[PDB]
Each structure stands twice: as C-alpha cells, then as structure tokens.
Prior knowledge:
Chain A has 218 residues and is mainly β. Chain A has no helices and 20 strands. Chain A has 2 domains: 1-117, no CATH class; 118-216, Immunoglobulins (Immunoglobulin-like). In chain A, a hairpin with a 5-residue loop joins strand 17 (173-174) and strand 18 (180-189). With 9 residues, chain B is mainly beta. Chain C folds into 2 domains: 1-111, Sandwich (Immunoglobulin-like); 112-213, Immunoglobulin-like. In chain C, 4% of the residues lie in helices and 53% in strands. Chain C has helices at 125-128, 186-190; strands at residues 3-6, 9-13, 18-24, 29-30, 33-34, 36-41, 48-52, 56-57, 65-70, 73-78, 87-93, 100-101, 105-110, 117-121, 132-142, 147-153, 156-157, 162-166, 176-185, 194-201, 207-212. In chain C, strands 2, 6, 7, 8, 11, 12 and 13 form a 7-stranded mixed sheet that branches. In chain C, strands 1-3-10-9 form a 4-stranded antiparallel sheet, with no helix packed on it. Classes of the chains: A mainly beta (218), B mainly beta (9), C mainly beta (216). Chains in contact: A-B, A-C, B-C. At the A-C interface, strand 5, strand 9, strand 10, strand 12 and strand 13 of A face strand 7, strand 11, strand 12, strand 14 and strand 15 of C. The PDB classes it as immune system. The entry lists the keywords immune system, antibodies, E2. It forms a trimeric assembly. The entry is titled "Structure of the Hepatitis C virus envelope glycoprotein E2 antigenic region 412-423 bound to the GL precursor of the broadly neutralizing antibody AP33".
Amino acid sequence: VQLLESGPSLVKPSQTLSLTCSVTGDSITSGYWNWIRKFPGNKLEYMGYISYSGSTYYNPSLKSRISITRDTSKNQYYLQLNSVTTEDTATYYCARITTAYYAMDYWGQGTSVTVSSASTKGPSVFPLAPSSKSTSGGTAALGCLVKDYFPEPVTVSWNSGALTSGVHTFPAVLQSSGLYSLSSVVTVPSSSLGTQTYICNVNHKPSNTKVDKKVEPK
Amino acid sequence: LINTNGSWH
Amino acid sequence: LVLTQSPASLAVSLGQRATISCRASESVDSYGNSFMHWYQQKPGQPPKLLIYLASNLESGVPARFSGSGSRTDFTLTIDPVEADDAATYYCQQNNEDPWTFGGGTKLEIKRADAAPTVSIFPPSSEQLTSGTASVVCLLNNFYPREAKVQWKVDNALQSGNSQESVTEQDSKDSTYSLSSTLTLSKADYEKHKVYACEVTHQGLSPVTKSFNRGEC
C-alpha cells in the first residue's frame, strides 16, 4: 500500500486549495480514504474521508468549505478546500482506514501548503567550508547554508543520500524579509577532507529548483 | 462494521 | 467530544517507564471495541500507527509499547523506553463525530550531560559577492537542550542581527544540535576583524569560538 499526495505548495488567500492522493497496492473501492493536516505548532486535525461507496464524512468545523471526491478508474481521490486563509497553512496527509484496524495505518509523506500572497523564490546555496575552526579531535564539521527561499519546504541530502551518518538539517528560520533560511551540517573525519567528495543536494520543489553544491575545505 | 457520518455500526 | 492528552511533555531516562494518558469527555466504545488509537510522529515523517483499538499492537511495533483502558480513560506505556522513542505521541478517537486527535505529548529522553562541540564558519566568498555576510555558529551534539549563544564582533555584543534553530532529539545518542546565523552587510563585515560566538551550557565555563578575518 502506497499513498502519494500532489498539489500546489503556495495558494493565495480566499482561493481554493486542491490536492490529489494517488493510491497503489489497493483499490479505493475498499475501505475509507482520509485527509489529515498538521498545522504549524504540531496540532493535528482530521478533515474527512470518502468511503468505498462514494459517501463522505466531514469535520463539522470544515464541512462548509470542504469537498472530497474520487476517481475509481485512476485509484485517486481529491481534497478541495475553498476560501483558504493563512490559518490553512499546514502539511496535508492522506491515509487509509480498513475494518481490520479501524485506524489510519498507511499514510503518505505529507504535502506542505502555505497560504500567502507572496511570490515563490528559489534559494541561494552557500558552502559552510570545513576548516581548523570547525574541526575537533579528528572530526571536521561542514555543511551548506540554504538562504532566502519561499515558501517551505526545502529538503537536503548529502552525496545523493550516500551520506546519512552525522547529518543535521536544522529547522528553517523566517527572516525579516519574508524569506526562509536554512542550514544543514554533517560531521566527517578530518583525514577524509582530502580524498572524499562531499556534496549537499538541496531540493526546493515549490520553485522547481534543485541545487547540488560541492563543499571543500578552506 | 461500516461507518456513516462518523459512527460505526 | 474532547480528548485531553496528559501530560503535554515528559522527560524519562533510558530504560525507565513512560506513561501517557488520554481522557475523553464521552465514551469512545461501541460494539465491543474501544475506538482509541495511538500514533507516533517524528519530524519529516507521517504519523505511525502503534496501537489500534486501545490495546492492540500494530505489526512490527516492539512489545515495549502497550496500551490499556476503556470508555473515557486510556494510557500508553513504553517500558523500557529507548533512544529511538523520542517523539511526539497522539491519541485519536473515531467512535463518533467529530473525529479528533489529542493535543500530543512530546517525549524527551534523559541522558547524561554532553557539552557541545562548537564550530564556527565564516561567510563564503561567493556570498560576499552578493553584498551580504552570514556568519554561522554550530553547537553539535549536546544535552540538555538549554543553551545560550551570544555573538560578539570586536568584543561588542550583537542584538537584533542573529537567529537560531535547534534540531529535535537525536534518535541514537539523544543529543540536540543548534545552528546560529549572524547576518551583516558585506560593508559592515569588512570593518571588523574578531568574530566570536560565546556559548553558555550546563555541561561546560563559557567557551568563546571565534575567527579573525584574513588570518587563518
């Protein structure tokens, strides 16, 4: 069972948000098929389901401006939220309920939706070069600064995912300009700086941008 | 069980 | 119906027992089942089903986890708690409209103290080209989470020109990391030589990590 959400990262206020959930490994004509969102600050809100027979149930505090639809010949169902506001910024999840569990067992990776009038802007990527000022013992720290993008989210890997041990991708901060800034770091042996290549892989899907930056010592 | 408007029956 | 999760947060040491409670304002039981479920969520991941129907263990979940209760009173218990269990936990009821999640419970792991390894990074030459200079201070792998970072420029304290973020608790050594960024114009950055980042942490005296412009 696999659920994949799709939709826009940035919607303007008072407009309609439209998300899609694609299902594989299972038919949407069995069970129930839910939408869930997580607001900033981590509170979780159930939105509603569409059943195996096309019948819906909506959260009473959203029933007025929510619609859930489906297409059985695409194994897809769809969330629509009208008259969005900044309070509808959140990460949106689809999930499945079966009568075996009566709980939401399979989820998709979320989709980030920001409601705002601001325009999308891609990040600048600068190296955090390892040096004698970022080394300790035989361990060197190094990373990438991901600066001045909008909206969220940004994702960062290292060496296309080959480097996972030691990585810390920090939460983004909101600068006074309205643009987010992020840094990711990893720790490596200092004796590896001369032989092993280190590359951060910065993905900003809202701007359709991917940036790969090689970081070298000072 | 099946669910209708939130309640299983 | 209202789901009160208690407590809102909870620090436990490795190997000890952690209990999280969830109370409803009306029974979530019908047709011989408790429609109460417990989820774990970590940053950058969907929530994960741990316990369905109040006491039933989801497949591939270690039996260190367990849930009990009926009607309006449910608890989850992790015994013994492991470093990978640092996360937020949620209860959820779908017995009746409106389906609702609990407020959540942030579980922290208590370990021995760990001082931060402090790195400092000067602005890249590529960024200076743009006319802005970011200076970054890293506090790596430290416990407890409380840490203070002050920026000095030629021994002068800085206000209003820096920001910081902290990671969540690491799933392996139960430490936190912290990144701080000082932002200046290229012109201001070129008029000063000593750039310093002073860390106060319980596991340390204060330790100033600095660099000098031009000098290596």
